Design a protein around this ligand. Structure first.
Ligand SMILES: [K+]
Ligand SMILES: [K+]
Ligand SMILES: [K+]
Ligand SMILES: [Mg+2]
Ligand SMILES: [Mg+2]
Ligand SMILES: [Mg+2]
Ligand SMILES: [Mg+2]
Ligand SMILES: [Mg+2]
Ligand SMILES: [Mg+2]
Ligand SMILES: [Mg+2]
Ligand SMILES: [Mg+2]
Ligand SMILES: [Mg+2]
Ligand SMILES: [Mg+2]
Ligand SMILES: [Mg+2]
Ligand SMILES: [Mg+2]
Ligand SMILES: [Mg+2]
Ligand SMILES: [Mg+2]
Ligand SMILES: [Mg+2]
Ligand SMILES: [Mg+2]
Ligand SMILES: [Mg+2]
Ligand SMILES: [Mg+2]
Ligand SMILES: [Mg+2]
Ligand SMILES: [Mg+2]
Ligand SMILES: [Mg+2]
Ligand SMILES: [Mg+2]
Ligand SMILES: [Mg+2]
Ligand SMILES: [Mg+2]
Ligand SMILES: [Mg+2]
Ligand SMILES: [Mg+2]
Ligand SMILES: [Mg+2]
Ligand SMILES: [Mg+2]
Ligand SMILES: [Mg+2]
Ligand SMILES: [Mg+2]
Ligand SMILES: [Mg+2]
Ligand SMILES: [Mg+2]
Ligand SMILES: [Mg+2]
Ligand SMILES: [Mg+2]
Ligand SMILES: [Mg+2]
Ligand SMILES: [Mg+2]
Ligand SMILES: [Mg+2]
Ligand SMILES: [Mg+2]
Ligand SMILES: [Mg+2]
Ligand SMILES: [Mg+2]
Ligand SMILES: [Mg+2]
Ligand SMILES: [Mg+2]
Ligand SMILES: [Mg+2]
Ligand SMILES: [Mg+2]
Ligand SMILES: [Mg+2]
Ligand SMILES: [Mg+2]
Ligand SMILES: [Mg+2]
Lengths: 119, 73, 155
RNA sequence: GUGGGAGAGGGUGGUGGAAUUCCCGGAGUAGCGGUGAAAUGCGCAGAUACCGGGAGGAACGCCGAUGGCGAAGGCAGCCACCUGGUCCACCCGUGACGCUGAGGCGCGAAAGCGUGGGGAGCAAACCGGAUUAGAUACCCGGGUAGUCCACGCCCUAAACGAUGCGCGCUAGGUCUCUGGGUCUCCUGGGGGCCGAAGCUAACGCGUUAAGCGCGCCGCCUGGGGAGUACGGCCGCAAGGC
């Protein structure tokens, strides 16, 4: 119960799960959701439909705090990013700006064998 | 094929070694803080090579960005 | 059908109501190539529709067929070595085919004595929104849309 | 010699931002992670996701390329200092001072060894979870030496253009890097592609020769046994010649 009425929406989309964190304009979170907060347990979380459900659930939780407009921030390349985008877009929440802010290094650390053949 | 406009052709007389001229080096960066390739800038090999180091200097001085964020995705 | 597209067969219209849909339902009723027996069954079922309902049996028939048509089904697909139940829409021809097949099959599951009574009761119950055929439609539209998580495997 | 030029060539010191991890605080709640699917794992001692601050180690995104430099290995943020090679123009100086090179000497990726330090990420060995007929594997969660630094060893490789060095001669076209010039183009040095003559068993090579010649060094003489044995030399050892 804070009545923020305007904040940010971070989307963390990986190939294994999509998780949505709704925060205030300073970044402090309010509510959140993910594929695991919905009934989906295993690989079904890395599904665009699961991402849609997570986005809609986080949006409905933010409705309790009476929030209307959000600023969307996307991080990570994963199946279900655009589906969460389109879920938040038409959810009653006014989407003011969508921004991709995926953290890309300047070739700092050595990846795992899974991500090798690169630097 | 980058048929919109060349940065050099959309510009006049300028110094390629001036790391303090921010408003002219801003044109040579993309929407992100990244340095534009040759197909976008329309510079020569030597020109682009000098531009790279001058942009890096302008970045270290705090004038140009190392990286920006993408909007309207 | 690999080379061609296998154009649909055009059925002859009905001798009574002039509807090709009635003829298709006759054919799904037909057994061992006994057309006259199937026509007897269906037209006696129509005579059962009246004197049990003031509405013409053609309207009840078409409304039941419309109530049985499914909107989405679920087909299997082999992806990544596993087999998934992918939901997808249904073309109108397959809607009609499944509707008539389910109508006949559910009618013959009834405990009624003779065939005309089975078909008539199934048509009436499906028109008013119940029976085994509507149960099949609900089960298919439950399996589909119960696996919404595979909608991106539509193909 | 003079005057210019390009360069991740090398060494030393300093310095910047992104990211990973960890610590502190805020906010916040039931999972995160991971896979074909899972489980170990981590999470109510509050994780993941988000914001801010701090520490540390390592590597430099875009530029960036089929590019550049170096004898090879190899070299990629930025700044300064020290320093090597090289190219062009002038036609100035010396006057055959040249080429090659058995030995010798020095350099020599990675891994490995010694002493000290460092240790974020990764990760042999190893500890587990899966898979499997079994799985001393691939897949997943951890993880030590190591990877990093200083100094000293080690001398190996698909150390590759699988092509020793130098010089001269023998059609061109095209792309490119870098100079000079009467700057459509010409001329010189380097990096590619296609091709004259010619060569090759063929594939292919073809002014960057695998063509035509000359000089000098290295090496080959059927396969296995075998880069093994013995001997010698070198090395702390692994081991190398
Ligand atoms: K090269
Ligand atoms: K130690
Ligand atoms: K020129
Ligand atoms: Mg998952
Ligand atoms: Mg049935
Ligand atoms: Mg250098
Ligand atoms: Mg905390
Ligand atoms: Mg973990
Ligand atoms: Mg752990
Ligand atoms: Mg536990
Ligand atoms: Mg508690
Ligand atoms: Mg974390
Ligand atoms: Mg932080
Ligand atoms: Mg530490
Ligand atoms: Mg690149
Ligand atoms: Mg070179
Ligand atoms: Mg090499
Ligand atoms: Mg003279
Ligand atoms: Mg003289
Ligand atoms: Mg020599
Ligand atoms: Mg020698
Ligand atoms: Mg060595
Ligand atoms: Mg080493
Ligand atoms: Mg050591
Ligand atoms: Mg040590
Ligand atoms: Mg690890
Ligand atoms: Mg591992
Ligand atoms: Mg194991
Ligand atoms: Mg087996
Ligand atoms: Mg077993
Ligand atoms: Mg540790
Ligand atoms: Mg040791
Ligand atoms: Mg090679
Ligand atoms: Mg060789
Ligand atoms: Mg050979
Ligand atoms: Mg040669
Ligand atoms: Mg040339
Ligand atoms: Mg050729
Ligand atoms: Mg010929
Ligand atoms: Mg030929
Ligand atoms: Mg030659
Ligand atoms: Mg032999
Ligand atoms: Mg022999
Ligand atoms: Mg042998
Ligand atoms: Mg050996
Ligand atoms: Mg040996
Ligand atoms: Mg011996
Ligand atoms: Mg000894
Ligand atoms: Mg050994
Ligand atoms: Mg051994």
């Amino acid at each position: 119960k804070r009545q923020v009425a305007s904040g940010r929406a971070y989307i963390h989309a990986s190939y294994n799960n999509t998780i949505v964190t709704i925060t205030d304009p300073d970044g402090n979170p309010i509510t959140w959701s993910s594929g695991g907060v919905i009934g989906y347990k295993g690989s079904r979380k890395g599904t665009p439909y699961a991402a849609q459900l997570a986005a809609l659930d986080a949006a409905k939780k933010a409705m309790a705090y009476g929030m209307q407009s959000v600023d969307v921030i996307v991080r990570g390349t994963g199946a279900g990013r655009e589906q969460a985008i389109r879920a938040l877009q038409a959810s009653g929440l006014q989407v003011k700006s969508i921004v991709d802010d995926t953290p890309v290094p300047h070739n700092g650390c050595r990846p795992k064998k899974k991500f090798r053949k690169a630097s | 094929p980058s048929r919109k406009a060349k940065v050099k052709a959309t510009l006049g007389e300028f110094d390629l070694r001036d790391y303090r001229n921010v408003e002219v080096l801003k044109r040579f960066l993309s929407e992100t803080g990244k340095i534009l390739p040759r197909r976008r800038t329309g510079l020569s090999a030597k020109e682009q090579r000098i531009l790279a180091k001058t942009i890096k200097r302008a970045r270290i001085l705090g004038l140009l960005p190392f990286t920006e964020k993408l909007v309207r995705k | 059908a690999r080379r061609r597209r296998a154009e649909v067969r055009q059925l002859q219209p009905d001798l009574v109501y002039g509807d090709v849909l009635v003829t298709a339902f006759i054919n799904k009723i037909m057994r061992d190539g006994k057309k006259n027996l199937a026509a007897r069954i269906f037209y006696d079922a129509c005579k059962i529709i009246q004197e049990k309902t003031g509405q013409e049996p053609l309207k009840v028939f078409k409304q039941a067929v419309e109530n049985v048509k499914p909107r989405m089904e679920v087909r299997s697909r082999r992806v990544g070595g596993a087999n998934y139940q992918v939901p997808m829409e249904v073309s109108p021809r397959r809607q009609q085919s499944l509707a008539l097949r389910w109508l006949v099959q559910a009618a013959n599951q009834r405990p009624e004595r003779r065939a005309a009574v089975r078909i008539a009761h199934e048509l009436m119950d499906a028109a008013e929104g119940k029976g085994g055929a509507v149960k099949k439609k609900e089960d298919v539209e439950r399996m589909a849309e119960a696996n919404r998580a595979y909608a991106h495997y539509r193909w």
